[PDB]
Amino acid sequence: SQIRQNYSTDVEAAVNSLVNLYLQASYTYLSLGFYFDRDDVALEGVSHFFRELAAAKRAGYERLLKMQNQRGGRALFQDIKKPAEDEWGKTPDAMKAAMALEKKLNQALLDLHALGSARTDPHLCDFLETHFLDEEVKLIKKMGDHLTNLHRLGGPEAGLGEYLFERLTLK
Amino acid sequence: SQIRQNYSTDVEAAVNSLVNLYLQASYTYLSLGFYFDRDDVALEGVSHFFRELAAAKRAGYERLLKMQNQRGGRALFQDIKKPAEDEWGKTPDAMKAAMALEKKLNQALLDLHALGSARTDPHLCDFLETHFLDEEVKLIKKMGDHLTNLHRLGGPEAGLGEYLFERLTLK
Amino acid sequence: SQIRQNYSTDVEAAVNSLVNLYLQASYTYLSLGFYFDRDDVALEGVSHFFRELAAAKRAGYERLLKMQNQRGGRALFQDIKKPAEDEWGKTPDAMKAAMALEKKLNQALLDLHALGSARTDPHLCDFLETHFLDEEVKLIKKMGDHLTNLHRLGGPEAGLGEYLFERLTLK
Amino acid sequence: SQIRQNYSTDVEAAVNSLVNLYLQASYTYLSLGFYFDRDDVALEGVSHFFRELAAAKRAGYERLLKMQNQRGGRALFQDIKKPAEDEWGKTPDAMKAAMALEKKLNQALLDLHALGSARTDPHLCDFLETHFLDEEVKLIKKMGDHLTNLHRLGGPEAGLGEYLFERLTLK
Ligand SMILES: [Fe+3]
Ligand SMILES: [Fe+3]
Ligand SMILES: [Fe+3]
Ligand SMILES: [Fe+3]
Ligand SMILES: [Fe+3]
Ligand SMILES: [Fe+3]
Ligand SMILES: [Fe+3]
Ligand SMILES: [Fe+3]
Ligand SMILES: [Fe+3]
Ligand SMILES: [Fe+3]
Ligand SMILES: [Fe+3]
Ligand SMILES: [Fe+3]
Ligand SMILES: [Fe+3]
Ligand SMILES: [Fe+3]
Ligand SMILES: [Fe+3]
Ligand SMILES: [Fe+3]
Ligand SMILES: [Fe+3]
Ligand SMILES: [Fe+3]
Ligand SMILES: [Fe+3]
Ligand SMILES: [Fe+3]
Ligand SMILES: [Fe+3]
Ligand SMILES: [Fe+3]
Ligand SMILES: [Fe+3]
Ligand SMILES: [O]
Ligand SMILES: [O]
Ligand SMILES: [O]
Ligand SMILES: [O]
Numbered sequence: 001s002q003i004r005q006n007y008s009t010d011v012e013a014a015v016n017s018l019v020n021l022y023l024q025a026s027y028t029y030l031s032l033g034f035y036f037d038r039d040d041v042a043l044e045g046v047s048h049f050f051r052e053l054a055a056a057k058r059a060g061y062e063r064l065l066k067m068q069n070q071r072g073g074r075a076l077f078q079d080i081k082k083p084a085e086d087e088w089g090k091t092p093d094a095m096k097a098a099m100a101l102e103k104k105l106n107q108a109l110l111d112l113h114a115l116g117s118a119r120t121d122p123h124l125c126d127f128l129e130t131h132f133l134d135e136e137v138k139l140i141k142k143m144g145d146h147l148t149n150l151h152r153l154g155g156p157e158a159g160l161g162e163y164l165f166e167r168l169t170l171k
Numbered sequence: 172s173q174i175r176q177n178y179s180t181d182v183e184a185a186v187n188s189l190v191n192l193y194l195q196a197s198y199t200y201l202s203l204g205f206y207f208d209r210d211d212v213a214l215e216g217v218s219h220f221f222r223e224l225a226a227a228k229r230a231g232y233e234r235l236l237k238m239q240n241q242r243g244g245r246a247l248f249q250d251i252k253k254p255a256e257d258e259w260g261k262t263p264d265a266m267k268a269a270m271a272l273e274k275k276l277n278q279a280l281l282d283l284h285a286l287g288s289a290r291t292d293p294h295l296c297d298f299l300e301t302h303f304l305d306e307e308v309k310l311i312k313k314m315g316d317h318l319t320n321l322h323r324l325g326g327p328e329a330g331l332g333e334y335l336f337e338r339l340t341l342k
Numbered sequence: 343s344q345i346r347q348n349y350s351t352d353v354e355a356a357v358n359s360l361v362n363l364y365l366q367a368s369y370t371y372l373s374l375g376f377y378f379d380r381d382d383v384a385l386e387g388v389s390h391f392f393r394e395l396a397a398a399k400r401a402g403y404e405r406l407l408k409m410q411n412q413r414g415g416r417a418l419f420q421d422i423k424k425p426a427e428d429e430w431g432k433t434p435d436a437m438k439a440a441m442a443l444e445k446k447l448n449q450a451l452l453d454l455h456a457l458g459s460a461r462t463d464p465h466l467c468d469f470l471e472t473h474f475l476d477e478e479v480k481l482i483k484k485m486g487d488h489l490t491n492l493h494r495l496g497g498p499e500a501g502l503g504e505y506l507f508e509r510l511t512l513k
Numbered sequence: 514s515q516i517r518q519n520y521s522t523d524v525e526a527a528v529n530s531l532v533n534l535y536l537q538a539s540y541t542y543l544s545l546g547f548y549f550d551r552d553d554v555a556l557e558g559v560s561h562f563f564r565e566l567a568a569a570k571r572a573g574y575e576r577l578l579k580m581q582n583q584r585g586g587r588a589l590f591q592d593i594k595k596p597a598e599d600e601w602g603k604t605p606d607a608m609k610a611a612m613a614l615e616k617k618l619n620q621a622l623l624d625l626h627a628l629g630s631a632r633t634d635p636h637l638c639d640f641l642e643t644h645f646l647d648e649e650v651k652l653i654k655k656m657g658d659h660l661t662n663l664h665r666l667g668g669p670e671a672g673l674g675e676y677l678f679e680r681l682t683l684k
Contacts, residue, residue: 001381001382001657002381002382002612002657002660003381003653003654003656003657005616005619005620005653006619006623023369023422027365027419027422030407030419031417031419034407034408034410034411034417035417037408037411038411038416039312039315039316039319039343039344039345039411039414040315040319040343040344041319042315042316042317042319042320044316065372065376066376066379068376069376069379069380069381069654070650070651070654071650072381072654072657074380075373075376075377076428077369077372077373077424077425077428078424079421079422079423079424080365080369080421080422080424081421082419082420082421082422083419086418086419120623120627120630122623122626122630122638122641122642122646123642123646123647123650125642126642126643126646126647127647129642157328159323159324159325160323160324160328160331160332160335162323163320163323163324163332163335163336163339164335164339167335167339167340168339270344274347277347277348278347281348281462281464284464285462288462288464296464299464300464300465300467300468300471301468304464304465304468305465305468305469308412308413308465309412311345311347312345312411312412312414314345315343315344315345315414318344381654381657381658381661382657382661383661384657384658384659384661384662386658499670501665501666501667502665502666502670502673502674502677504665505662505665505666505674505677505678505681506677506681509677509681509682510681
């Protein structure tokens with residue numbers, strides 16, 4: 001590559017790997033999105049929440065692909081694994097799955113930062129610092145807040161809580 | 172008729188028949204509308220919902236009458252049967268009646284499409300495809316969503332649920 | 343399902359199947375998009391062309407998923423197969439791959455129309471007629487036009503042709 | 514210095530050194546700029562391209578000088594070495610020289626980041642991360658793209674290619 005400079009084969013491959021992780025996460029959010037739109041689930045605000053995350057994850061992998069090209073890396077794509085579940089339960093269940101997915105993505109981001117730090121690749125580090133790490137932190141905080149409000153609305157009268165949360169918190 | 176072309180006597184009569192079905196459905200929604208406006212029912216958003224459907228069904232039969240005239244058919248009107256009930260219960264009860272009415276109208280629409288398909292009348296088919304079939308599908312989906320939200324708000328604390336639904340879902 | 347009416351299990355499954363085909367096609371266009379953005383390919387207009395198709399295919403599968411929910415179907419997702427190639431050659435090569443992909447999607451659409459026609463499901467038929475069939479036809483015509491212009495610009499001085507086409511035809 | 518804090522003598526001197534490298538690079542781009550404006554070269558778009566880089570490099574050294582003052586460093590200036598060539602050849606030749614210059618500047622930037630990292634000077638690191646590293650990466654990618662398009666337009670009919678590139682790619 002005529003442009004490649006300070007860009008290790010390890011980062012390149014880990015970038016390709018993080019791309020597939022974002023594709024898979026996007027896919028997961030697509031599935032949660034349509035799930036909450038089913039006539040027998042029917043929580044429009046929950047559906048919108050997960051649809052937006054699909055979109056947000058797609059921006060993530062598009063930005064990783066662009067950075068790959070900018071550094072002189074070559075994108076390689078693998079199969080995208082189907083989401084882990086077909087039916088996602090109630091809002092708390094789905095929100096817990098989403099939290100778990102975001103934590104996995106955040107760990108992959110931190111591992112990639114550690115890697116690029118180890119290959120003294122400050123561009124790669126900064127790129128993640130600027131476009132990824134704070135967004136995960138904000139999003140995780142938000143999902144925690146949601147879980148706290150669902151838990152407070154939970155238990156005995158869970159059905160009413162789920163309705164109120166979708167109406168009064170989600171948009 | 173100087174304009175009539177490819178327009179079978181069967182379609183013509185089935186169109187007249189579907190007209191009476193829309194008139195009757197409009198009538199049913201009129202009754203549900205005023206029902207939820209009674210001082211002892213007093214669910215303004217439910218009332219508005221059913222009033223709008225009366226209006227929507229009237230547009231339906233007006234469009235069938237116009238198409239009848241355009242194809243060279245002759246409108247014939249029968250008595251409009253009074254609605255099946257005088258008192259409509261709670262929101263879930265009424266919403267179930269509405270669902271059942273929409274399913275009946277949808278089946279009549281599908282039967283008329285089958286008929287016009289059998290008389291190779293593609294205008295009649297397309298007319299239904301364009302002005303009726305998707306609207307039934309959207310409306311049925313919406314009524315399902317509503318039923319799911321009422322069910323979730325149901326049971327022990329049904330009175331509160333009925334209030335919240337009318338306030339936070341219906342407009 | 344409380345809303346499902348005239349919606350066969352076969353259509354439902356074929357809809358799920360067409361969804362995976364759109365996901366895979368979207369994926370293919372993603373790959374072609376970044377391919378033409380590589381510093382050693384560097385055909386920005388070709389890149390934009392394929393990026394737009396990724397987006398267009400995503401709208402396709404989102405509309406199929408929405409229709410699935412509207413009819414009372416249940417979405418089921420499988421693994422998304424990686425694109426058939428890692429390197430896509432020159433503009434004519436990639437444009438031929440795209441043509442071949444669009445023809446496959448069009449055949450799947452026509453097969454699904456045949457199926458829904460056979461289950462007398464006029465909603466499903468019309469939905470495809472309105473949101474899919476004409477768009478494939480226009481797009482295929484466009485890809486043919488492109489292939490004709492690349493062929494005319496081809497052979498001995500292929501490198502110059504590829505440059506001019508990207509600059510003067512693609513946007 | 515009454516303001517100096519965490520600012521090593523090594524960084525200070527390496528900053529002065531990077532300044533002279535930017536001055537020299539600016540000078541190189543000045544020379545390429547006027548070169549392509551000669552009546553016997555006459556490639557206005559190539560001239561503009563290199564003139565802009567002169568300007569961009571000047572912003573670079575001005576920002577390094579400002580940072581020097583902000584940290585309590587003292588600017589020291591040396592002679593600015595004349596550009597390596599008097600005549601710059603064809604667009605591909607000049608674009609290769611520019612690529613080689615940008616790679617040298619990028620390596621100097623990376624070496625200075627390594628240095629400030631080694632003196633645990635996170636301000637210096639971030640400053641480079643924010644104002645320099647991504648700009649080099651974007652610019653190098655752009656110069657690669659250009660080289661790919663010139664190469665595609667190259668060889669037998671190089672004169673025509675050079676004309677088209679200047680007219681249809683450069684602004
Ligand atoms: Fe939102
Ligand atoms: Fe399951
Ligand atoms: Fe708020
Ligand atoms: Fe929002
Ligand atoms: Fe929004
Ligand atoms: Fe309304
Ligand atoms: Fe009664
Ligand atoms: Fe149509
Ligand atoms: Fe048709
Ligand atoms: Fe709403
Ligand atoms: Fe309204
Ligand atoms: Fe209204
Ligand atoms: Fe376009
Ligand atoms: Fe390959
Ligand atoms: Fe049609
Ligand atoms: Fe044109
Ligand atoms: Fe466009
Ligand atoms: Fe565009
Ligand atoms: Fe410029
Ligand atoms: Fe010379
Ligand atoms: Fe451009
Ligand atoms: Fe400009
Ligand atoms: Fe300019
Ligand atoms: O939103
Ligand atoms: O409404
Ligand atoms: O475009
Ligand atoms: O420019």
